[PDB]
Design goal:
The structure is cut from a larger assembly and holds two copies of chain A (93 residues).
Chain A lengths: L9 H11 L4 E3 L3 E6 L2 E6 L11 E3 L35
Antiparallel strand pairs in A: 1-4, 2-3
Chain lengths: 93, 93
């Protein structure tokens, strides 16, 4: 009911996620609720990178977050955190 | 109702199928349920080959699985295998 195409900066979302979840654990595939600019979103932890692939880990201040739009969603995301724009050449590869 | 257009790779799901079903009994035409990333799939055994076609065989660590999306199934798979044929003449004896 709150879907919109308004822009959202992915790096800002990552910074807020780290700030609110600093020193808080996360496991691959975890489904949670995330607050960005008083806007609610559903987040699925797709991958965890060791700083080795581990199913679970602990969030720290320097951890990066890469936000990819869920397929079939109109959410508009911008920034270099995960993806902002992509092009698909017309010629067959 | 859980059907979705999100791509699925047969390699990952086949590796997990083996991990969760390796060193177990499998019969031709056997039906079971398989979990992959908290997603349930119905699997039907079509044809079995022994490392010789066997009615019942024991999946193992080195077991190989070729997965085919069911007929009239929107599942996206990066692999499948099914082959059989024959031929006749075009001159009455």
């Amino acid at each position: 009911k709150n879907i919109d195409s308004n822009p959202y900066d992915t790096d800002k979302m990552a910074a807020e996620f780290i700030q609110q979840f600093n020193n808080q654990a996360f496991s691959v595939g975890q489904q949670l609720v995330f607050s960005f600019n008083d806007k609610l979103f559903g987040l699925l932890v797709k991958d965890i990178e060791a700083m080795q692939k581990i199913e679970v880990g602990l969030v720290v201040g320097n951890s990066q977050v890469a936000f990819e739009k869920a397929e079939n969603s109109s959410l508009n995301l911008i920034g270099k955190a995960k993806t902002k724009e992509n092009r698909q050449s017309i010629i067959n590869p």
